[PDB]
Short mmCIF file of N, CA and C in Angstrom, two decimals:
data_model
loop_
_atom_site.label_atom_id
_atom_site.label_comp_id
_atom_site.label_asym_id
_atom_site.label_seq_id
_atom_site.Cartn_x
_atom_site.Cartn_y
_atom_site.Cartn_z
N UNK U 1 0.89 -1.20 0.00
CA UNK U 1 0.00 0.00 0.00
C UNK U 1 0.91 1.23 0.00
N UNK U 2 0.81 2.06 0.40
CA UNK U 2 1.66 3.68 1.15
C UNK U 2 2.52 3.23 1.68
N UNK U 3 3.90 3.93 1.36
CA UNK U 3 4.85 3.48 2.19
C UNK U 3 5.64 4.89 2.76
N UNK U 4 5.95 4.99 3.83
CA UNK U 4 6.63 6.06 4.39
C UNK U 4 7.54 6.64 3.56
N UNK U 5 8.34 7.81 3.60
CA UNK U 5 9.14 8.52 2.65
C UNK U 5 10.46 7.89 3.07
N UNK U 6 10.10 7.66 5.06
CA UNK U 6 11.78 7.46 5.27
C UNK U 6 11.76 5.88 4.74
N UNK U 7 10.78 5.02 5.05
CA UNK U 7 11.13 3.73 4.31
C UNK U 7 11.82 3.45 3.09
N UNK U 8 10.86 4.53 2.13
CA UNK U 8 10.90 4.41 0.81
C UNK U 8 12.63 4.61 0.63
N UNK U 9 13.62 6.13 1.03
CA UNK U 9 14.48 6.30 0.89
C UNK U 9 15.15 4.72 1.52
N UNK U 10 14.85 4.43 2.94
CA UNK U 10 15.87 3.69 3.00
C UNK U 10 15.66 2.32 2.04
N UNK U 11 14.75 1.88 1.95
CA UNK U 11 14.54 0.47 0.38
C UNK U 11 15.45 0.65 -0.75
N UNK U 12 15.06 2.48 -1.24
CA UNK U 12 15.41 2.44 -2.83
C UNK U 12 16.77 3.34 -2.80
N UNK U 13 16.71 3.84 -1.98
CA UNK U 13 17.97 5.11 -2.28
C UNK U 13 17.71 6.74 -1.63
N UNK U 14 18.49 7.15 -1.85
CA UNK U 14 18.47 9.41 -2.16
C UNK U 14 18.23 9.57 -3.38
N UNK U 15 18.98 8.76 -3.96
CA UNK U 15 18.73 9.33 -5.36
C UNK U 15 17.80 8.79 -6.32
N UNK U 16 17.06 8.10 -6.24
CA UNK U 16 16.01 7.58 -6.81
C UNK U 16 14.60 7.63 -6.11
N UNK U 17 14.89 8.38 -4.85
CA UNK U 17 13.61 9.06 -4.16
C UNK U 17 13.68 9.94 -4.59
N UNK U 18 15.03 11.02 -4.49
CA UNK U 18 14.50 12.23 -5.33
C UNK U 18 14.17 12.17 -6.11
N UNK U 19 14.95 11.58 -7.54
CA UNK U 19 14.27 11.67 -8.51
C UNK U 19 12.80 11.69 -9.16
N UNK U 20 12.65 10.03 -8.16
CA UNK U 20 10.49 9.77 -8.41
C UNK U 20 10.21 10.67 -7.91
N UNK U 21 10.26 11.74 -6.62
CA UNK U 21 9.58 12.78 -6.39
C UNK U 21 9.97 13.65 -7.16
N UNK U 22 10.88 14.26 -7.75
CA UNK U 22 11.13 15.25 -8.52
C UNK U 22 11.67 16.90 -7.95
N UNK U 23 12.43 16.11 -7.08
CA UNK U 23 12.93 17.07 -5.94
C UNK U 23 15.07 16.74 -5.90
N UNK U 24 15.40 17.88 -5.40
CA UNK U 24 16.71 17.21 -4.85
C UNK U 24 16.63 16.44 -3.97
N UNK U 25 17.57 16.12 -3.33
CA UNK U 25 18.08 14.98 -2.20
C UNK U 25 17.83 15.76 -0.79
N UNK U 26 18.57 17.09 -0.65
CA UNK U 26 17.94 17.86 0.37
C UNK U 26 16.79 17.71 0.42
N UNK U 27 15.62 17.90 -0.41
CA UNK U 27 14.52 18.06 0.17
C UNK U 27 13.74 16.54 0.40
N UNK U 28 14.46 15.67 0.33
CA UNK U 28 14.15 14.39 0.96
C UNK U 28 14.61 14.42 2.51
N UNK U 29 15.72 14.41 2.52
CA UNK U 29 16.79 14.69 3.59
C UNK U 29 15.71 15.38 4.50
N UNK U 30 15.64 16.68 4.19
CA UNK U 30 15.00 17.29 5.02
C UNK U 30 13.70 17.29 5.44
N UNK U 31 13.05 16.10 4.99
CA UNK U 31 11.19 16.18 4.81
C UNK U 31 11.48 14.63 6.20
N UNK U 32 12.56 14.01 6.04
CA UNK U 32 12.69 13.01 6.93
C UNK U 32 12.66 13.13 8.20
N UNK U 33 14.11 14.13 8.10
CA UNK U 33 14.59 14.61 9.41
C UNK U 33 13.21 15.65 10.36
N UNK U 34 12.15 16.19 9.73
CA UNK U 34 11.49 16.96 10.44
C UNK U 34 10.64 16.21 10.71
N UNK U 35 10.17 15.69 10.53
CA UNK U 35 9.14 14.21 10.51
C UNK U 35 7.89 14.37 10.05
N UNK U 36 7.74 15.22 9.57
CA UNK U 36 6.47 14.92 7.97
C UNK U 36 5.96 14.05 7.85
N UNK U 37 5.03 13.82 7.74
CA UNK U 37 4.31 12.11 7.60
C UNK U 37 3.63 12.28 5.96
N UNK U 38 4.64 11.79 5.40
CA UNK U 38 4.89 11.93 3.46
C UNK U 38 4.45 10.30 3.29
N UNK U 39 3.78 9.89 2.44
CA UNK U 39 3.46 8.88 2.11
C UNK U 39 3.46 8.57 0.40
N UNK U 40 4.04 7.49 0.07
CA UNK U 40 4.13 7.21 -1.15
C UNK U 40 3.48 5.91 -1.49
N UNK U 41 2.79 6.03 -2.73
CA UNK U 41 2.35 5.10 -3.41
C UNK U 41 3.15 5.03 -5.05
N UNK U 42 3.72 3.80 -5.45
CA UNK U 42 4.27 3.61 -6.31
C UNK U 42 2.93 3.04 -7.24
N UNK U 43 3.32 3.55 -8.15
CA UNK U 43 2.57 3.47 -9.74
C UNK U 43 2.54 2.09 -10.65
N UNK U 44 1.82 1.75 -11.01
CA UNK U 44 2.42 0.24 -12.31
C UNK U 44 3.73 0.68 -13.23
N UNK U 45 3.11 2.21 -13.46
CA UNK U 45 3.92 2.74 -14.58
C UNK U 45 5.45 2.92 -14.32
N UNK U 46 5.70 2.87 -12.87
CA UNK U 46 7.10 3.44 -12.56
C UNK U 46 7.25 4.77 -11.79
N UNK U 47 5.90 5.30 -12.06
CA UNK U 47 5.83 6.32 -11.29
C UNK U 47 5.38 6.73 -10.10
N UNK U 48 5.62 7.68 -8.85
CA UNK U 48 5.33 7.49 -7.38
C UNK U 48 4.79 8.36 -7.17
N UNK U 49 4.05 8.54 -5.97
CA UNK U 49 3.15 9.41 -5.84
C UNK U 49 3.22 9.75 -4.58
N UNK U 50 3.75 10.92 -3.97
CA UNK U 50 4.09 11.35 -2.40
C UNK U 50 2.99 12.33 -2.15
N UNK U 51 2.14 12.21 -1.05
CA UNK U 51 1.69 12.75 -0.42
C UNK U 51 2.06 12.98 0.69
N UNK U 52 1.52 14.71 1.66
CA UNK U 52 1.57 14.33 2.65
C UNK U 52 0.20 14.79 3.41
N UNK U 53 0.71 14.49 4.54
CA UNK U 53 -1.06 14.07 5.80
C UNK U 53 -0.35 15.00 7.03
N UNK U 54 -1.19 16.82 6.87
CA UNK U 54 -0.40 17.85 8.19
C UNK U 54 -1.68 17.96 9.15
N UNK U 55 -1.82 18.63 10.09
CA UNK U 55 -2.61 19.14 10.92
C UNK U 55 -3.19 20.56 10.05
N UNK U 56 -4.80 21.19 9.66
CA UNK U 56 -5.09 22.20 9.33
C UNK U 56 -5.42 23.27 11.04
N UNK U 57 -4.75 24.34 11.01
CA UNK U 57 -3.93 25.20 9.87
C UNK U 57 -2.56 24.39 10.05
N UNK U 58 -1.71 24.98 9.22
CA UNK U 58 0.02 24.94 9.12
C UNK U 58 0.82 25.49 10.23
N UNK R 1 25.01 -12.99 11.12
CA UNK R 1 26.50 -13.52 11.26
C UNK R 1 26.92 -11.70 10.92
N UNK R 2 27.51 -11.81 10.25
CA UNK R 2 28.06 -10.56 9.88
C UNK R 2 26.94 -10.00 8.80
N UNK R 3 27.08 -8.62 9.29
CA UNK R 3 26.02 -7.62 8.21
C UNK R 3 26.94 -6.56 7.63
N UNK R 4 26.49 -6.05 5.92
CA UNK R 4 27.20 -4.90 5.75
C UNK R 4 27.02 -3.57 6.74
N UNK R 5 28.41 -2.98 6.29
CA UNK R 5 28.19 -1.79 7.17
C UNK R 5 26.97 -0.61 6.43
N UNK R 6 26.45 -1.05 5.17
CA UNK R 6 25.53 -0.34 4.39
C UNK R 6 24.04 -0.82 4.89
N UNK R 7 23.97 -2.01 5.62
CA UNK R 7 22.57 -2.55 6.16
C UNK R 7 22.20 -2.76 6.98
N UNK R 8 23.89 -2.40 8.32
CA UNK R 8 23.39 -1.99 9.25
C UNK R 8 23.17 -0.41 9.53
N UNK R 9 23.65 0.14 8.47
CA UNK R 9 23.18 1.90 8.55
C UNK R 9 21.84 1.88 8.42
N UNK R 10 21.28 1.46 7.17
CA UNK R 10 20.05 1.27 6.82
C UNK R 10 18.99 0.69 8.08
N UNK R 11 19.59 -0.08 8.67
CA UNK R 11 18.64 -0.38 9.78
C UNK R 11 18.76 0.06 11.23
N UNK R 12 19.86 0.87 11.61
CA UNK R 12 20.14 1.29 12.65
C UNK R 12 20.08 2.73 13.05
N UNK R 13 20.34 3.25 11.43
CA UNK R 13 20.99 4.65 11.26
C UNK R 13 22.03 5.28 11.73
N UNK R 14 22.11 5.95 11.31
CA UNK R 14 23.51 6.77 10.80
C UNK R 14 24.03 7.27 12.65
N UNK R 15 23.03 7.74 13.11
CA UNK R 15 23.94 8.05 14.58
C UNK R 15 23.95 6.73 15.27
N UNK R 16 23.51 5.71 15.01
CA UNK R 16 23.72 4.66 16.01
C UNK R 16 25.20 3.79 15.82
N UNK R 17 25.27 3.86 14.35
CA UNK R 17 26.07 3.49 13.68
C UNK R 17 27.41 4.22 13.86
N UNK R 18 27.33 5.01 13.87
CA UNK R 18 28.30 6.37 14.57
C UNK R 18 29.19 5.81 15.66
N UNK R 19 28.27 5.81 16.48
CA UNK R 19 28.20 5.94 17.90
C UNK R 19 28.93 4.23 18.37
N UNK R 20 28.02 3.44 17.90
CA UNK R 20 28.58 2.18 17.95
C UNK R 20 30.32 1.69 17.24
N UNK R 21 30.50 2.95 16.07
CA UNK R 21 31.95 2.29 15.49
C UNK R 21 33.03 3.03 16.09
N UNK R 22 32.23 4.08 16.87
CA UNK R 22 33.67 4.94 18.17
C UNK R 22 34.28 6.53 16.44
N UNK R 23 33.23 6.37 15.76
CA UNK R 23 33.12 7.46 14.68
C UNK R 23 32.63 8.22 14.49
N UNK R 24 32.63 9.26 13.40
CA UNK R 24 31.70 10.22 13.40
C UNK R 24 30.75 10.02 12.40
N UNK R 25 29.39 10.32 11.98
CA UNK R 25 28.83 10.17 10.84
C UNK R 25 29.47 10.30 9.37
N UNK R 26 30.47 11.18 8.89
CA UNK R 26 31.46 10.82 8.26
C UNK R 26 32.11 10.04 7.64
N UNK R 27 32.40 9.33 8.61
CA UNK R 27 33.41 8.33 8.05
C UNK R 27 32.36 6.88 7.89
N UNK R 28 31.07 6.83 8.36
CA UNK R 28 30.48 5.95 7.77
C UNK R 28 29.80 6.58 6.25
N UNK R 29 29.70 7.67 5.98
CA UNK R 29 29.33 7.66 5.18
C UNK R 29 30.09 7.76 4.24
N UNK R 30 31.45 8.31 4.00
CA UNK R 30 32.29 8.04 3.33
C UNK R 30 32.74 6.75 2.95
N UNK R 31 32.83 5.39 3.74
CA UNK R 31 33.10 4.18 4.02
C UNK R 31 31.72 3.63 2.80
N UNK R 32 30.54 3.43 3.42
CA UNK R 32 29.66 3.58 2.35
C UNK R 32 29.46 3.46 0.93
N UNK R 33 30.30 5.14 0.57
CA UNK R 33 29.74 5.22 -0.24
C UNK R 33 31.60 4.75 -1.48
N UNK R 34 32.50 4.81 -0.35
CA UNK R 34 33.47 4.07 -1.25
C UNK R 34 33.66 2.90 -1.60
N UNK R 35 32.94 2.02 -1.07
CA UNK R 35 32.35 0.40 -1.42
C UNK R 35 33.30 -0.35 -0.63
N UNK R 36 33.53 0.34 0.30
CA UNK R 36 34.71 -0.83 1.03
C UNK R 36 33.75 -1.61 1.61
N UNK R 37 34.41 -3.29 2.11
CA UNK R 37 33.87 -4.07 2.07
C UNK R 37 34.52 -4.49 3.89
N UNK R 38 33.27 -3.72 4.49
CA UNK R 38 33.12 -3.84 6.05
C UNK R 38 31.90 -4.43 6.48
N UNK R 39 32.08 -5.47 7.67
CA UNK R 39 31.31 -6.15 8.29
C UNK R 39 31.12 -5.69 9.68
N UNK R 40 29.96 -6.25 10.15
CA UNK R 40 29.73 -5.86 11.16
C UNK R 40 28.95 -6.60 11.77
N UNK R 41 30.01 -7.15 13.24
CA UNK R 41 29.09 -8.42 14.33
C UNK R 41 28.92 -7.50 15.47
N UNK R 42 27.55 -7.87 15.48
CA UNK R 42 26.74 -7.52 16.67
C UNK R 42 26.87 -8.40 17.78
N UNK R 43 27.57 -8.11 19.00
CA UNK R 43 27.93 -8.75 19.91
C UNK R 43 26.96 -8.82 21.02
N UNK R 44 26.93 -9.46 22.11
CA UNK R 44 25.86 -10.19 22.98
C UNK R 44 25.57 -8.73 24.11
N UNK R 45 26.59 -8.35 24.20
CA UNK R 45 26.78 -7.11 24.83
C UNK R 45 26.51 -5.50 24.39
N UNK R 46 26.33 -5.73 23.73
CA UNK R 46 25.55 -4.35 22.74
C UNK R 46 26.44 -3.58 21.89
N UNK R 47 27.99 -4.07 22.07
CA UNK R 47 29.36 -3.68 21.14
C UNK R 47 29.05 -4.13 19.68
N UNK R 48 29.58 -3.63 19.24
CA UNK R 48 29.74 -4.24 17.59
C UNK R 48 31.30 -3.91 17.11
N UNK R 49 31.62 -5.21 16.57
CA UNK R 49 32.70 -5.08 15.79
C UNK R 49 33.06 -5.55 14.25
N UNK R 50 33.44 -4.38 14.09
CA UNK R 50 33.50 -3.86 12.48
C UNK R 50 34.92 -4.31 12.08
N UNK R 51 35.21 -5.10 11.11
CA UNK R 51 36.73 -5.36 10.20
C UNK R 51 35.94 -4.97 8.56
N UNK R 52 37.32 -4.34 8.19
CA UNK R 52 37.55 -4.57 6.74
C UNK R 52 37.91 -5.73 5.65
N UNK R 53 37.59 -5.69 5.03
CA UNK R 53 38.38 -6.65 3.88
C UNK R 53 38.92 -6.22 2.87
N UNK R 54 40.14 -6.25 2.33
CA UNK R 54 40.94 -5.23 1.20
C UNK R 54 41.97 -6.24 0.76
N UNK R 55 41.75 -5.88 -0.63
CA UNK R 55 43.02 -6.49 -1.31
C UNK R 55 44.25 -6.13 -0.49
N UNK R 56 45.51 -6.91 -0.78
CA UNK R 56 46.67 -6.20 -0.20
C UNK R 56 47.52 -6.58 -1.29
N UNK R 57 48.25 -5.44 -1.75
CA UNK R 57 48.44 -4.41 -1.08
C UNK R 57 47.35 -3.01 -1.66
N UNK R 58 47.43 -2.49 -0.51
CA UNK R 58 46.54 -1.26 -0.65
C UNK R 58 46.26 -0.65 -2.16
#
């Protein structure tokens, strides 16, 4: 199903999390370390899909 | 038996890993990412000890 961002990095990589997200490596790095609750769903196609889940307001 | 030093980062992280090789985050990640070929036994006592393996000569 959804898999955490920090999972995801630690399974696949930095650099192939950033990439599927479409971000640098910092902003993986840093979405970990603050603890964001980012959730990814991987695609048939290859492609991933990060969401995240905050408290309203910000 | 013995685990890489890349899978016990992955499962321990980076400050435990640190902390446990008497290092700084640094030098595991440098170690890492230069492909040296380090093991790591987890001892009964909560020590771990880490050897290299390297051609010789250097």
């Amino acid at each position: 199903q959804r898999i955490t961002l920090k999972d995801y990095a630690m399974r696949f990589g930095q650099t192939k999390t950033a990439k599927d997200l479409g971000v640098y490596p910092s902003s993986i790095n840093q979405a970990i370390h603050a603890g964001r609750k980012i959730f990814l769903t991987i695609n048939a196609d290859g492609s991933v899909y990060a969401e995240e889940v905050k408290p309203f307001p910000s």
